[PDB]
Design an enzyme around this catalytic site. Structure first.
Site, short mmCIF file in Angstrom:
data_model
loop_
_atom_site.label_atom_id
_atom_site.label_comp_id
_atom_site.label_asym_id
_atom_site.label_seq_id
_atom_site.Cartn_x
_atom_site.Cartn_y
_atom_site.Cartn_z
N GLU A 238 -14.43 -16.31 33.31
CA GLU A 238 -15.45 -16.63 34.31
C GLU A 238 -16.57 -17.44 33.69
OE1 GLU A 238 -16.66 -12.90 36.70
OE2 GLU A 238 -18.52 -13.99 37.08
N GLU B 147 -17.11 -6.80 34.52
CA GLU B 147 -18.25 -6.77 33.62
C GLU B 147 -18.77 -5.39 33.29
OE1 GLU B 147 -21.32 -9.76 34.69
OE2 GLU B 147 -19.92 -11.40 34.36
#
Ligand code: NAG
Ligand code: NAG
Ligand code: NAG
Ligand code: NAG
Length: 344
Positions: A276, A169
């Protein structure tokens, strides 16, 4: 067959089979001191019909942990240490070996944006500056690149790697979007110079895309531009994540998030991976429709839920969180078996 994972047209080719895949996230699979605990978990994932697992390639500290505890790298301004010992990168070796033995492939990121298992914050403590200047800090980038060579050089000729991933991320809060574009272009060129057998991807959440409804995740406040990033020449496919309860959106908004990202990947000539995702309330009801949308949208090559949960020979259970899907449970029936049955 056992071959290197490649791209075939608009889709993925895994051991000679071209088409859509399902997988799961298991960050914790990388930090096990008994290899039999990795092996029992991978036996269960493989018999469930899943083909790919995402696992951490990092464990960063500023001070060594209690003797016996695992650590992969110690960051210091007076000389950093990469641990290849029994309590170091040998526990990640256990995971690559187990994947070869149970016919699975792995996605592996090299650093965390968040402070869990050290992350960008552990580099900041050692080398100065802050979380946004990290991308251009000379001493921090020199050590990150040394850590990348130490990991890639162990597994570059193994057929169990699906792809290398630059981070978990990556964000640059309030920054120009060009900071991450220039950093990712240079780093992905470096990974390809070390390994010509495998694919490479960014690991971003997918933030910043103008074809949506204008909710915050589609705007440009976290230093990322999805279309610009997916067009980088040394990246092979796109990634995106999904967490409506943390983002202030409702659950059904996730279907449109999947559709817009899939179209942006296809406009760049590449597949997307829905890497995810989770819902805090009623997961079977709320996540099942997302799984069907990804399977039936052009431009989508696979999906992986957050996260796997399992138990060991000694009666202990793995690390868990609010999103855990325990092997053999009612939620394993709804989100794993039923989804694998719809793919084939
Ligand atoms: C971090 O550092 C740079 C200054 O070198 C500055 O421009 C930016 O405002 C700082 N970030 C925060 C969150 O203060
Ligand atoms: C390993 O893979 C590299 C490509 O990244 C290749 O050049 C080299 O020959 C391979 N090693 C062996 C022993 O085959
Ligand atoms: C899972 O369930 C099956 C029955 O459906 C059983 O045969 C198997 O032993 C179980 N495995 C575990 C680890 O519980
Ligand atoms: C909530 O979100 C979308 C807009 O983001 C709206 O069109 C839809 O009707 C809503 N869905 C539910 C069931 O709340």
């Amino acid at each position: 067959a056992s071959s290197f994972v490649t791209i075939s047209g608009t889709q993925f080719n895994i051991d000679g089979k071209v088409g859509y895949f399902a997988g799961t996230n298991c960050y914790w699979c990388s930090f096990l001191t008994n290899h039999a605990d990795v092996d029992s978990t991978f036996s269960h994932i493989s018999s469930s019909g899943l083909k790919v697992v995402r696992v951490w390639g990092f464990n960063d500290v500023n001070t060594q942990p209690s003797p016996g505890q695992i650590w992969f790298q110690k960051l210091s301004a007076t000389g950093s240490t990469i641990n290849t010992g029994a309590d170091g990168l040998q526990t990640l070796d256990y995971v690559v070996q187990s994947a070869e033995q149970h016919n699975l492939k792995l996605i592996i990121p090299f650093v965390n944006n968040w402070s869990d298992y050290g992350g960008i914050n552990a580099y900041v403590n050692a080398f100065g500056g802050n979380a946004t200047t990290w991308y251009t800090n000379t001493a921090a980038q020199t050590q990150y690149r040394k850590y990348v060579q130490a990991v890639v050089s162990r597994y570059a000729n193994s057929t169990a790697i699906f792809a290398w991933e630059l981070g978990n991320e990556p964000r640059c809060n309030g920054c120009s979007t060009d900071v991450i574009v220039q950093w990712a272009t240079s780093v992905s060129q470096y990974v390809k110079s070390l390994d010509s057998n495998h694919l490479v991807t960014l690991g971003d959440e997918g933030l910043g895309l103008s074809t949506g409804d204008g909710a915050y995740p589609y705007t440009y406040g976290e230093g990322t531009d999805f279309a610009k990033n997916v067009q980088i020449k040394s990246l092979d496919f796109g990634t995106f994540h999904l967490y409506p309860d943390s983002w202030g959106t409702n659950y059904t908004w996730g279907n449109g998030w999947i559709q817009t990202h899939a179209a942006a990947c296809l406009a760049a000539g590449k597949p997307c991976v829905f890497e995810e995702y989770g819902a805090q309330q009623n997961p079977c009801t709320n996540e099942a429709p997302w799984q069907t949308t990804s399977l039936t949208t052009r431009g989508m090559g696979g999906d992986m839920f957050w996260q796997w949960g399992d138990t060991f020979a000694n009666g202990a259970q793995s690390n868990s969180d609010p999103y855990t899907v325990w092997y053999n449970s009612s939620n394993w029936q709804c989100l794993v078996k039923n989804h694998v049955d719809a793919i084939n």
